[PDB]
Design a protein around this ligand. Structure first.
Ligand SMILES: CC(C)(COP(=O)(O)OP(=O)(O)OC[C@H]1O[C@@H](n2cnc3c(N)ncnc32)[C@H](O)[C@@H]1OP(=O)(O)O)[C@@H](O)C(=O)NCCC(=O)NCCSCC(=O)c1ccc(O)cc1
Ligand SMILES: CC(C)(COP(=O)(O)OP(=O)(O)OC[C@H]1O[C@@H](n2cnc3c(N)ncnc32)[C@H](O)[C@@H]1OP(=O)(O)O)[C@@H](O)C(=O)NCCC(=O)NCCSCC(=O)c1ccc(O)cc1
Ligand SMILES: CC(C)(COP(=O)(O)OP(=O)(O)OC[C@H]1O[C@@H](n2cnc3c(N)ncnc32)[C@H](O)[C@@H]1OP(=O)(O)O)[C@@H](O)C(=O)NCCC(=O)NCCSCC(=O)c1ccc(O)cc1
Ligand SMILES: CC(C)(COP(=O)(O)OP(=O)(O)OC[C@H]1O[C@@H](n2cnc3c(N)ncnc32)[C@H](O)[C@@H]1OP(=O)(O)O)[C@@H](O)C(=O)NCCC(=O)NCCSCC(=O)c1ccc(O)cc1
Lengths: 141, 140, 141, 140
């Protein structure tokens, strides 16, 4: 699968290379039911005009990583998972190198899963944290 | 260039190469208390399941709120940056546009706070995103 | 009903005057399905040791007001409503007088309702805002 | 008096009369990077349905995070106050205790950020509450 997203269905409405994710280059490294990690190389496509990594990039990386780590478990159970809320706090700017994300599952309820995502730069500093609440619902189709 | 506020003579990254230029955000109106922006939905704004990406609502809110604060404080020697964002997703968007309206609710000496509503073509509320914006002295 | 909370059941596990709400003195003024208002007189019981209204008081008032405004609609439909998340931002301290809250319903989904609560002082200044997400689930008993 | 940090000679409100003294919060450990507190559940901490009040988790997180920051910055001429709190409720608590553990995750010059886990007697995670704490020069 492109970007290493979990391969859980035969076809997807939008190919990975055309999505926001494939455009900026998000890649999943490890993925388990309780923990997943992903990273992205910073290029201008991830920056805003003042030269820092965009606020939206940290949110998008957290959202994809936490939701897909959820999809990877629940999809075969006949469920979908979508992001329901995201709370992100920005501690230090990233200007270049990579952003690495580590998502840790802190609650798995029957309707809601909750993941804490830490976003670090190449020196290992904590630049942002992003909490994701993921809704889990029976598939429609 | 997106109609972002033109406050400086040079910018490190050109608008068309930024995340904002890549997905196509454009500012429509901008005043100190209220700003609006919009974007057409294309695959670049979607995730693999075909819905507008969670990141895209957050990106829009953050650019709009922060640049609407830049518009006011830059000429005063201040920089403005997003410090936190809280986004809640009520209804997905599949196609058409996403239209954002940011309303300034607090303007403190060190922090401004904006509420950003994000609506689809039918005018339905699809997400809200609160942005807290830190305002600090420019570093020379 | 004590504090003017919606009267939706014959008996409640804890009487109003013994609850956190009745202890600090929260009172509901208006209540509709899309809008509710409440207030509280500030006394030391609502303050922290440095003399300001406690952070917890703004959250508690928002949580009670948004959840009960939800209970008032859904209870007779056989549902319960509980607070699922709360995000509060504090703009200006309140030292005395009253805190008045106005909750406005911004989304009513089939599993989740979302209320924005503004908290003002007696001069009408906006001192805090508190977003409440309320989960709505079938009753257990 | 709750074991709060004793940083000043006089406090405007005595601990037993504060919201914190009224519901019974007590600090157990406090270091610059980590603090713990607990409270017994009584009706005063509950809402009318018999569950611990949403406000009670938020109150606990906010007092603990802020006072753990006071402990460090007060002697440096700074005051600390809660600037935002985000609390998510995973499982209700009906009786027993609520035990809070606050871990400092960022300590910036103007903002500190703490994550506070709130657990019941069985040690289950019932809520988490992130606290952002503004740190500013004391006003004389
Ligand atoms: C928000 C805040 C300024 C608060 O500061 P703090 O908690 O007191 O932390 P502190 O001030 O100790 O600084 C930590 C790092 O902040 C940076 N910083 C702090 N103050 C300043 C300043 N006055 N000038 C420049 N950098 C600063 C600096 O990198 C610092 O490290 P150091 O160089 O001092 O070692 C700091 O945490 C921070 O800079 N966070 C990152 C903000 C960020 O990166 N947000 C996302 C990007 S801007 C939002 C956005 O998406 C956008 C999009 C499009 C668009 O067109 C415009 C904006
Ligand atoms: C979260 C929730 C499911 C909760 O539902 P609710 O608050 O109870 O609202 P309700 O169920 O009344 O539904 C409102 C709308 O949600 C949709 N919805 C609700 N349940 C379902 C379901 N089981 N299946 C499909 N759609 C549903 C539906 O569109 C509905 O409108 P209608 O067609 O029923 O009129 C609904 O609010 C919602 O869908 N919010 C939008 C979720 C969203 O779009 N999040 C962001 C995108 S997914 C996160 C992400 O960024 C990501 C990125 C990359 C990647 O690879 C994976 C994910
Ligand atoms: C957080 C912040 C300091 C950020 O400031 P800002 O966004 O730049 O706004 P600005 O600085 O323009 O000031 C607005 C108001 O803030 C207050 N303020 C701001 N800076 C200061 C300062 N250095 N010293 C004293 N007051 C200040 C002041 O009242 C101001 O109005 P004015 O007198 O200047 O007209 C300001 O918004 C604020 O004070 N918010 C209220 C904080 C609050 O009330 N939080 C809850 C109480 S403390 C958290 C807690 O629950 C706790 C519980 C138990 C316990 O034992 C300890 C703590
Ligand atoms: C929000 C939610 C219902 C979502 O469920 P989820 O994330 O899918 O988790 P799941 O459904 O797996 O359930 C976990 C636990 O929640 C409880 N729960 C879930 N569904 C139900 C239900 N339909 N009925 C009763 N309890 C339920 C149950 O305790 C469960 O454990 P178990 O007994 O099933 O092992 C669950 O996370 C939860 O209950 N969180 C706690 C809610 C809470 O305690 N909020 C604060 C208090 S209510 C807000 C308030 O402050 C207020 C104040 C004054 C006032 O007058 C009114 C309200």
């Amino acid at each position: 699968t492109g970007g290493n997203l979990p391969d859980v269905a035969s076809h997807y409405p939008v190919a990975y290379e055309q999505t926001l994710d494939g455009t900026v280059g998000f890649v999943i490294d490890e993925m388990t039911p309780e923990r997943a990690t992903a990273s992205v190389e910073v290029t201008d496509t991830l920056r805003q005009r003042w030269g820092l990594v965009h606020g939206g990039a940290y949110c998008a990386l957290a959202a994809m990583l936490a939701t897909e780590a959820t999809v990877a478990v629940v999809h075969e159970k006949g469920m979908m998972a979508v992001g329901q809320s995201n709370h992100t706090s920005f501690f230090r700017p990233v200007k270049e190198g990579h952003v690495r994300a580590e998502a840790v599952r802190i609650h798995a309820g029957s309707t809601t899963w909750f993941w804490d995502v830490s976003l670090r730069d190449d020196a290992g500093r904590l630049c942002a944290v992003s909490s994701m609440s993921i809704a889990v619902r029976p598939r429609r189709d």
